[PDB]
Design an enzyme around this catalytic site. Structure first.
Site, PDB file in Angstrom:
ATOM      1  N   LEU A 186       6.805   9.244  -7.714  1.00 57.96           N
ATOM      2  CA  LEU A 186       5.671   9.817  -7.001  1.00 57.96           C
ATOM      3  C   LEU A 186       6.062  11.142  -6.351  1.00 57.96           C
ATOM      4  O   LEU A 186       7.043  11.215  -5.603  1.00 57.96           O
ATOM      5  CB  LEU A 186       5.174   8.828  -5.947  1.00 57.96           C
ATOM      6  CG  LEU A 186       4.142   9.361  -4.957  1.00 57.96           C
ATOM      7  CD1 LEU A 186       2.838   9.701  -5.664  1.00 57.96           C
ATOM      8  CD2 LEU A 186       3.912   8.365  -3.830  1.00 57.96           C
ATOM      9  N   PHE A 224       9.047  -0.456  -6.003  1.00 58.80           N
ATOM     10  CA  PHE A 224       9.184   0.808  -6.719  1.00 58.80           C
ATOM     11  C   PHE A 224       7.827   1.447  -6.996  1.00 58.80           C
ATOM     12  O   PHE A 224       7.691   2.675  -6.951  1.00 58.80           O
ATOM     13  CB  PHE A 224       9.946   0.578  -8.026  1.00 58.80           C
ATOM     14  CG  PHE A 224      10.282   1.839  -8.771  1.00 58.80           C
ATOM     15  CD1 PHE A 224       9.401   2.367  -9.701  1.00 58.80           C
ATOM     16  CD2 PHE A 224      11.486   2.487  -8.553  1.00 58.80           C
ATOM     17  CE1 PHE A 224       9.710   3.524 -10.391  1.00 58.80           C
ATOM     18  CE2 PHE A 224      11.800   3.641  -9.243  1.00 58.80           C
ATOM     19  CZ  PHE A 224      10.911   4.162 -10.161  1.00 58.80           C
ATOM     20  N   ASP A 226      -0.905   9.924 -12.263  1.00 53.32           N
ATOM     21  CA  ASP A 226      -0.765   8.486 -12.416  1.00 53.32           C
ATOM     22  C   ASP A 226      -2.142   7.829 -12.475  1.00 53.32           C
ATOM     23  O   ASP A 226      -3.185   8.490 -12.428  1.00 53.32           O
ATOM     24  CB  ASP A 226       0.096   7.910 -11.290  1.00 53.32           C
ATOM     25  CG  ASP A 226      -0.647   7.801  -9.967  1.00 53.32           C
ATOM     26  OD1 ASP A 226      -0.235   6.972  -9.128  1.00 53.32           O
ATOM     27  OD2 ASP A 226      -1.628   8.543  -9.755  1.00 53.32           O
ATOM     28  N   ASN A 250      -2.314 -15.853  -6.734  1.00 46.09           N
ATOM     29  CA  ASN A 250      -2.615 -15.004  -5.586  1.00 46.09           C
ATOM     30  C   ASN A 250      -2.318 -13.540  -5.885  1.00 46.09           C
ATOM     31  O   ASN A 250      -3.027 -12.647  -5.405  1.00 46.09           O
ATOM     32  CB  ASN A 250      -1.824 -15.475  -4.365  1.00 46.09           C
ATOM     33  CG  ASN A 250      -2.546 -15.200  -3.061  1.00 46.09           C
ATOM     34  OD1 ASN A 250      -2.226 -14.248  -2.350  1.00 46.09           O
ATOM     35  ND2 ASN A 250      -3.528 -16.035  -2.742  1.00 46.09           N
ATOM     36  N   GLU A 300       7.561   2.289 -16.607  1.00 43.98           N
ATOM     37  CA  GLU A 300       7.237   3.643 -16.181  1.00 43.98           C
ATOM     38  C   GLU A 300       7.315   4.669 -17.300  1.00 43.98           C
ATOM     39  O   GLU A 300       6.682   5.725 -17.192  1.00 43.98           O
ATOM     40  CB  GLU A 300       8.171   4.081 -15.046  1.00 43.98           C
ATOM     41  CG  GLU A 300       8.199   3.146 -13.848  1.00 43.98           C
ATOM     42  CD  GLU A 300       6.969   3.273 -12.973  1.00 43.98           C
ATOM     43  OE1 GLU A 300       6.844   2.485 -12.013  1.00 43.98           O
ATOM     44  OE2 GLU A 300       6.129   4.157 -13.242  1.00 43.98           O
ATOM     45  N   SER A 359       1.070 -14.022  -0.930  1.00 44.15           N
ATOM     46  CA  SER A 359       1.884 -14.089  -2.140  1.00 44.15           C
ATOM     47  C   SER A 359       3.369 -14.209  -1.816  1.00 44.15           C
ATOM     48  O   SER A 359       4.103 -14.921  -2.511  1.00 44.15           O
ATOM     49  CB  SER A 359       1.624 -12.863  -3.010  1.00 44.15           C
ATOM     50  OG  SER A 359       0.282 -12.835  -3.464  1.00 44.15           O
TER      51      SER A 359
END
Ligand SMILES: *SCC1=CC(C)(C)N(O)C1(C)C
Ligand SMILES: [Cl-]
Length: 164
Positions: free
Chosen positions: A32, A104, A20, A132, A11, A117
């Site tokens: 966010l 996250f 973003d 996947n 990040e 997955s």
């Protein structure tokens, strides 16, 4: 290497609100702010999160508290989610950080949508799980970051984060 230093690499740290990869306003270490296209909505949400007149700029200390808050929220989201917890339960410490990394970034609800997955991961079918995971919006929107997380799932090592 741990989930905190993993996410710090993924990040980064930016002190002023930025956009973003999906066009959403975010600040700090991947915090966010809002999904609205209004910049004032982002500053208002930022003000609400910090509790002061930010004017779009946050300190390095406030960013790390936001970071701790978001990591705590991602963990709690996994443990309370009926589809995320059993997969998280079965994973080793390294792969547990990779799953927290996912939550996250795109939230509890989005990660729980990786039905195929997640079953792969719980059955320790790493190679198939990696295949996947690469077939998703996540992979072609943030390929560099997704490749690192997928490699972590595949190998159970931090090799994708070596020397980064
Ligand atoms: S699930 C994330 C998590 C694990 C542990 C190391 C116990 N933590 O302090 C949190 C809650 C961040
Ligand atoms: Cl844990």
């Amino acid at each position: 290497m741990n989930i905190f230093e993993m996410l710090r690499i993924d990040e980064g740290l930016r002190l002023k609100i930025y956009k973003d990869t999906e066009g959403y306003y975010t600040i700090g270490i991947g915090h966010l702010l809002t999904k609205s296209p209004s910049l004032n909505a982002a500053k208002s949400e930022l003000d609400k999160a910090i509790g002061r007149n930010t004017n779009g700029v946050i300190t390095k200390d406030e960013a790390e508290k936001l970071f701790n808050q978001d990591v705590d929220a991602a963990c709690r989201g996994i443990l309370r989610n009926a589809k995320l917890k059993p997969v998280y339960d079965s994973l080793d410490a390294v792969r547990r950080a990779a799953l927290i990394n996912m939550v996250f970034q795109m939230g509890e609800t989005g990660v729980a949508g990786f039905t195929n997955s997640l079953r792969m991961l719980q059955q320790k079918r790493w190679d198939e799980a990696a295949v996947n995971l690469a077939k998703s919006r996540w992979y072609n929107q943030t390929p560099n970051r997704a490749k690192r997380v997928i490699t972590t799932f595949r190998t159970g090592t931090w090799d994708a984060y070596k020397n980064l």
